[PDB]
Write an enzyme that holds these catalytic residues in place. Structure first.
Site, mmCIF file in Angstrom:
data_model
loop_
_atom_site.group_PDB
_atom_site.id
_atom_site.type_symbol
_atom_site.label_atom_id
_atom_site.label_comp_id
_atom_site.label_asym_id
_atom_site.label_seq_id
_atom_site.Cartn_x
_atom_site.Cartn_y
_atom_site.Cartn_z
ATOM 1 N N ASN A 46 1.752 -6.539 -3.753
ATOM 2 C CA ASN A 46 2.584 -6.088 -4.721
ATOM 3 C C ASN A 46 4.058 -6.398 -4.433
ATOM 4 O OD1 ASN A 46 0.497 -4.670 -6.273
ATOM 5 N ND2 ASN A 46 0.446 -3.118 -4.650
ATOM 6 N N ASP A 48 6.738 -4.631 -3.815
ATOM 7 C CA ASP A 48 6.993 -3.586 -3.088
ATOM 8 C C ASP A 48 6.671 -3.852 -1.575
ATOM 9 O OD1 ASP A 48 4.493 -2.468 -3.050
ATOM 10 O OD2 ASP A 48 5.265 -0.579 -4.089
ATOM 11 N N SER A 50 3.387 -3.392 -0.592
ATOM 12 C CA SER A 50 2.007 -2.870 -0.571
ATOM 13 C C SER A 50 0.977 -4.025 -0.947
ATOM 14 C CB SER A 50 1.778 -1.606 -1.522
ATOM 15 O OG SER A 50 2.097 -1.965 -2.797
ATOM 16 N N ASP A 52 -3.053 -4.361 -3.036
ATOM 17 C CA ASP A 52 -4.240 -3.965 -3.626
ATOM 18 C C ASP A 52 -5.447 -4.597 -3.204
ATOM 19 O OD1 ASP A 52 -2.449 -2.509 -5.235
ATOM 20 O OD2 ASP A 52 -2.307 -4.230 -6.644
ATOM 21 N N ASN A 59 -4.344 0.590 -3.967
ATOM 22 C CA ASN A 59 -2.948 0.377 -3.522
ATOM 23 C C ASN A 59 -2.606 1.006 -1.933
ATOM 24 O OD1 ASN A 59 -0.169 0.294 -3.119
ATOM 25 N ND2 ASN A 59 0.302 0.220 -5.549
HETATM 26 O O1 VO4 Z 1 0.727 -4.412 -8.829
HETATM 27 V V1 VO4 Z 1 -0.641 -4.339 -7.842
HETATM 28 O O2 VO4 Z 1 -0.467 -2.372 -7.816
HETATM 29 O O3 VO4 Z 1 -1.233 -6.299 -7.827
HETATM 30 O O4 VO4 Z 1 -1.877 -4.224 -9.097
#
Ligand code: VO4
Ligand code: VO4
Ligand code: VO4
Ligand code: VO4
Ligand SMILES: [Cl-]
Ligand SMILES: [Cl-]
Ligand SMILES: [Cl-]
Ligand code: NA
Length: 129
Positions: A46, A48, A50, A52, A59
């Site tokens: 992601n 930020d 993080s 998934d 997440n």
């Molecule tokens: O934007 V993640 O929370 O790849 O789905």
């Protein structure tokens, strides 16, 4: 593991997702299709920082520990790697937490954008569950 559609539906139902918090099985199958293409090993970073993980793209910002998400929580009390297993138990258990958190399946942006309001029964059509 890349599940087949009907094989995943059957596994999700066995693990108690069918009508969990009122969300029919097709909702769950649709979400998994668009989050991971039914691949338990799926990972995506992601913006930020993080990541998934797994079939339902859970997440690291809130739900699992990957050791590289500063300031994050681990509300499902698992390593994120556990969400990549061929057995979906850990992902289901965590998903039940998430869906109970207040916003239902809107937590999954692919579900809101691609499944919500659609004929989700199509996802389990013809399946011997
Ligand atoms: O934007 V993640 O929370 O790849 O789905
Ligand atoms: O969910 V079965 O494996 O009826
Ligand atoms: O104090 V503990 O939330 O694992 O029960
Ligand atoms: O019983 V496993 O779901 O942990 O096949
Ligand atoms: Cl499919
Ligand atoms: Cl972390
Ligand atoms: Cl809801
Ligand atoms: Na975390």
């Amino acid at each position: 593991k890349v599940f087949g559609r009907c094989e995943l539906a059957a596994a999700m139902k066995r693990h108690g997702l069918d009508n969990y918090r009122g969300y029919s099985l097709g909702n769950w199958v649709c979400a998994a299709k668009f989050e991971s293409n039914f691949n338990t090993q799926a990972t995506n970073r992601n913006t930020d920082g993080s990541t998934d993980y797994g079939i339902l793209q859970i997440n690291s910002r809130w739900w699992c520990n990957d050791g590289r998400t500063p300031g994050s929580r681990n509300l499902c009390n698992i390593p994120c790697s556990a969400l990549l297993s061929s057995d979906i138990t850990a992902s289901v258990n965590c998903a039940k937490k998430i869906v109970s958190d207040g916003n239902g399946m809107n937590a999954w942006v692919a579900w809101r954008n691609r499944c919500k309001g659609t004929d989700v029964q199509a996802w389990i059509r013809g399946c011997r569950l």
